[PDB]
Design a protein around this ligand. Structure first.
Ligand SMILES: C[C@@H]1Cc2c(Cl)cc(C(=O)N[C@@H](Cc3ccccc3)C(=O)O)c(O)c2C(=O)O1
Ligand SMILES: C[C@@H]1Cc2c(Cl)cc(C(=O)N[C@@H](Cc3ccccc3)C(=O)O)c(O)c2C(=O)O1
Ligand SMILES: C[C@@H]1Cc2c(Cl)cc(C(=O)N[C@@H](Cc3ccccc3)C(=O)O)c(O)c2C(=O)O1
Ligand SMILES: C[C@@H]1Cc2c(Cl)cc(C(=O)N[C@@H](Cc3ccccc3)C(=O)O)c(O)c2C(=O)O1
Ligand SMILES: [Zn+2]
Ligand SMILES: [Zn+2]
Ligand SMILES: [Zn+2]
Ligand SMILES: [Zn+2]
Ligand SMILES: [Zn+2]
Ligand SMILES: [Zn+2]
Ligand SMILES: [Zn+2]
Lengths: 399, 399, 399, 142
């Protein structure tokens, strides 16, 4: 039973900073929020709920040797690196993350939940679902001999080309122990593929994926850069759109009418624009796509906010260095999004996206996920980079 | 910055021969066409844009040992021969070609674009899409043990039998690096198959191929000898028909209403009729089909021109010897097609077929692809066999 | 440059406790041992070099659900558990370990050497080399369908049946990144096999393994319970024997004449005798062998010491709980081995077994691996269970 | 068809498991399973009969000579650079098999022991000889 003393409380539900408060933590949950048992003093700190990152890849980090690494390294190495990546993510103030690809996160989540290793609460999508030659196709850009020995990927590998294959792929994701579904509706940037915005799913296939996932209680996140694929995914009924680089008035209207969530991922765009100027960092197939698309995400996100599109917090880490996820907040504030809305987008809006009601706000009956900042983030957003107190599920990880 | 001096300019857009002109070439493009910087003199030459051959097979050439060669030779040998074939094609005045089958042309195109080898600009279809036992089926006429070992070809090998397989085949062609799609709608002549004009695709499969290709920005060329398969392909919405031996009034009406392009390929027909009389040149299964169909192409092409069917230039080289592609012009003129129309069918009509607007005519902003002939081709068509100046993308390959 | 102050120094080379001393640590190595720069005080602690455990299995730990776990869990889970196992091992005072089986340790060693995770210095044998149906055969006790699917294990899987297969197996271990070689000369206890002491290698196969390993600079450790297999392995020229339950006067004479090292592993025997009485902990095939064999190790080790056989320190952890490796010391002292010899068997004798001369003794030029104990271990051996200071390669991990 | 010099082509190289010329060195586990362990037809040999079959397969593939890697290298994804990777009884088999088909053998060797083995077996040329010493020089001269 630990009583936390906070000089200033941030109300995620409303978006205002209250006065001094005392939280009572018992059984890993918040019991009382009485204004004003071991005592923890945070008198000179602003108390805020734990943050959520709705777009990470904890089983990888981008490097100059990234592409040559896909044939030399085994998943055990990726797990050994993901241990440190998860610790870095947890220490930065992010008590929960949504992982959007990779077959090590379902195992990292199991390890963290058992107490073997330290890290945030993971909601893992698992393997991605794509079509032939798609953005998430595992055998893109392989020579002929390797492509014959592996064989054509099928629904069990994530690659589908019909309604029945899509149904089997969702069922195989459920069998493999996933918490949600992730599809690539259009092309990408960092893949060894020629296109970056071509429509790669049919409406009748995305509809099948959504219908199959609805039976197993899953939500679907769609990766889309181009207009046509993004429109198809929004019309089929996905839960969130991942980059939306070429969004236009029509697609904004459809998203507003449907209630789809938007995850801008400023950090990935800034990173790829900065690294596209260097020579040898990217392949020659990737550099043009990276230079062309990574520079238009900030304008689209600002326009989406000004048009009334619901925006949640995601960084696409794995591109950027794990543990520097909060720099995204400052980017959002620089793009014109208010600091209070940027803080709400990681606490309550993220919980709405995840479909869980036990986290997000410091209220009785919820999980005890509390962080504390040295300075006030509403006046100076840079204060998000100075975290001094981190508590997850009633356990103090950083004092 | 090279200024080209021409005594007579051929206007592809209109079809008339103008007077003396001066072309200004800079940055690989044409800037000015001022009538009248290094100077190139072609005062005694008729100036004309570069030619396009819309039907070639640069990976092969027909020979008396052609059929026995499919089990002994590797694609590396075919590439080593395609080097010389491409140089011969470029020197004959053809600065662009459309390749309609093979898995060496996508590599040859990449090599040419990088400057490793010399040749024309290639638009490569890649592997062909057929049905089981079709004209482009890779395992036609194989013994039982070999067919057991290789296995039944699937959508990844080009052989499809349903809508979903057709969709996967188009996606696999996109993944393999193709620029367009080629299907065999009926039977052929040079394949180890019993039929020559039977319908081998259903309308619901060609429609799927066309719909899938439209998403990836591809155009579809259809090989058809018989009436029913050709009618199905025209109704499904293909871009061009390849031989059309048994075309009839109805099919002509449908092609005129739809805007489908026609590629007669006189040279292949003449070659197969001449070589069908010899003994041992063709297999016993092929000789009857070759003798029966190769003799009807010239009568159909003349009727198609007289009925108002749009005709583009193609020779089906690989059957004939690479480098003698211009003889087709004389054949066309002998069939009754005017010389001016025969010259236009290789410059502007070919560009319309290819779907590119940067080539075809010597106008500002277009690519600098220029050839020069010793004599006038409008009075004597044989002058197409004497090319003295060849420039491709602002680079002089033949002076 | 950290100077460590010690009240009492233990001389591993001689086996006596000296007086107060001051160690100078720079660059990860020991520079000066001047009797008597940041200062570390350990005035009330007996200083001793870091310990080495010559027999561990860091990729696993025995549990009531151990046998049913070999078909449900993936190596990623084993790595996530090995992280904590390695940290526990390092904190107990063991700065180096020799791993004798499992394909996660070569990855764990790479991760530790890169600084990603904390743990001791690992010398990993990798996959074990056995014969058909042997103790280390991966497919022992599988039903017919599974054995059909996997296929008969070959030299690449560790299972050999001839001289050339043994040579290929050693070469494949070198290719996979191993530091030594481990073979199973006889049967075991914890395997799903009928025998526990039958000879499973021929002399001509062990000789081939030793000869192949000598080229790649490898040392060979042999697992042997029975007399005949142990005699064969000693005669072939292996470096160490792992359990030696049924050793007899002749085999002792051969080991003394050859210089083979002996690793008794008291802890595994005690553990299996205690757990064999329980019902459901072991399979019905394992319980008789465990009850029969695990009760004889202590009498053989005492006789071996009294006969003059060189004995090194090893516990066979993975059977016992990781992190309780020093209780073996007390067992040795209870068996009649002197405390000073038991302490030497983990510092200098272990380094002699490993074939490295940079560790073992606190002398100039050696690695700075230092631990400190609260009490004197020569008078009370129980003081080995109270470690207060742990420094590995000049870095302090426990103060 | 193309212009160039007169080529005498050795073809695929003959190595042992995990050797310098091993085609699957430094591949992850899934790729190594799908390709399978290289055999004598792929150039990787581990016995006398495999070496004989490898020379015969080189002859069948249209080679003009034989090339083996006696020791480790530099540019390969392998840990060693001078370890002995062939036994004398395997190099002798390669040389004896090649002598029937009228082939000459060139040996790649950096380290002393592998180079000595290759010289003693009867190869025609040594390729780098970085760690050659007086003894090996005497053997090569003789
Ligand atoms: C395992 C994981 C798989 C994966 C998948 Cl499935 C998708 C992405 C992805 O959406 N990447 C983006 C990165 C990016 C680049 C620019 C602007 C926004 C985002 C892309 O290339 O378009 C992606 O980045 C990754 C990734 O980093 O690895
Ligand atoms: C690689 C390439 C594949 C290929 C394909 Cl897919 C189709 C043809 C083809 O349409 N050949 C025609 C040749 C021909 C014969 C007579 C009249 C017109 C054309 C045929 O046999 O009907 C064809 O000729 C070829 C060919 O020559 O090799
Ligand atoms: C991965 C690793 C593989 C392995 C191998 Cl290869 C050998 C042993 C082993 O020697 N076990 C001993 C345990 C034991 C039991 C009683 C007395 C001494 C030792 C045995 O069953 O005879 C062994 O215990 C293990 C093991 O625990 O898992
Ligand atoms: C296809 C061909 C295969 C091949 C083979 Cl089998 C051997 C070598 C080779 O001997 N490389 C040398 C390069 C080298 C490096 C330093 C000093 C001398 C030579 C080595 O890595 O030791 C070698 O370089 C190559 C090569 O470059 O590719
Ligand atoms: Zn994405
Ligand atoms: Zn992503
Ligand atoms: Zn055709
Ligand atoms: Zn053709
Ligand atoms: Zn053992
Ligand atoms: Zn063991
Ligand atoms: Zn070499």
């Amino acid at each position: 039973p630990v009583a936390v003393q906070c000089g200033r409380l941030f109300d995620a539900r409303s978006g205002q900073l209250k006065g001094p408060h005392t939280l009572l933590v018992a059984d890993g949950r918040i019991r009382q929020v009485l204004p004003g048992a071991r005592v923890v003093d945070l008198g000179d700190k602003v108390c805020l709920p734990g943050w959520t990152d709705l777009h990470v890849h904890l089983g990888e980090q981008s490097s100059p040797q990234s592409y040559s690494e896909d044939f030399r390294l085994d998943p055990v190495d990726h797990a050994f690196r993901a241990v440190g990546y998860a610790e870095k993510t947890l220490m930065a103030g992010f008590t929960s993350v949504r992982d959007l690809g990779g077959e090590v996160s379902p195992h990292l989540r199991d390890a963290i939940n058992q107490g073997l290793v330290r890290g945030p609460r993971i909601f893992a999508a698992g393997k991605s679902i794509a079509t032939t030659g798609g953005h998430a196709d595992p055998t893109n850009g392989w020579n002929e001999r390797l492509a014959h020995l592996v064989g054509a990927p099928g629904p069990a590998e994530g690659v589908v080309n019909s309604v029945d294959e899509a149904r089997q792929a969702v069922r195989q994701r459920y069998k493999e122990g996933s918490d949600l579904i992730k599809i690539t509706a259009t092309g990408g940037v960092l893949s060894y593929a020629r296109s970056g915005d071509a429509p790669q799913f049919t409406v009748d296939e995305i509809k099948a994926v959504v219908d199959t996932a609805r039976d197993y209680g899953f939500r679907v996140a769609a990766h889309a850069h181009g207009t046509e694929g993004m429109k198809r995914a929004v019309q089929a009924g996905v839960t969130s759109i991942e980059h939306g680089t070429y969004m236009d008035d029509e697609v904004m209207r459809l998203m507003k009418q449907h209630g789809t969530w938007y995850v801008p991922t400023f950090y990935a765009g800034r990173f790829v624009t900065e690294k596209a100027a260097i020579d040898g960092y990217f392949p020659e197939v990737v550099r043009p796509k990276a230079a062309r698309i990574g520079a238009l995400i900030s304008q689209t996100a600002a326009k989406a906010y000004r048009n009334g599109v619901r925006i949640a917090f995601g960084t696409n880490q794995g591109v950027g260095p794990h543990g520097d996820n909060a720099r995204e907040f400052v980017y959002m504030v620089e793009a014109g999004i208010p600091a209070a809305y940027a803080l709400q987008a990681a606490t309550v809006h993220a919980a709405q996206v995840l479909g869980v009601d036990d986290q997000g706000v410091l209220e009785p009956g919820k999980r005890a996920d509390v962080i504390a900042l040295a300075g006030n983030p509403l006046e100076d957003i840079n204060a998000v980079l100075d975290v001094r107190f981190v508590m997850k599920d009633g356990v103090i990880y950083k004092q």
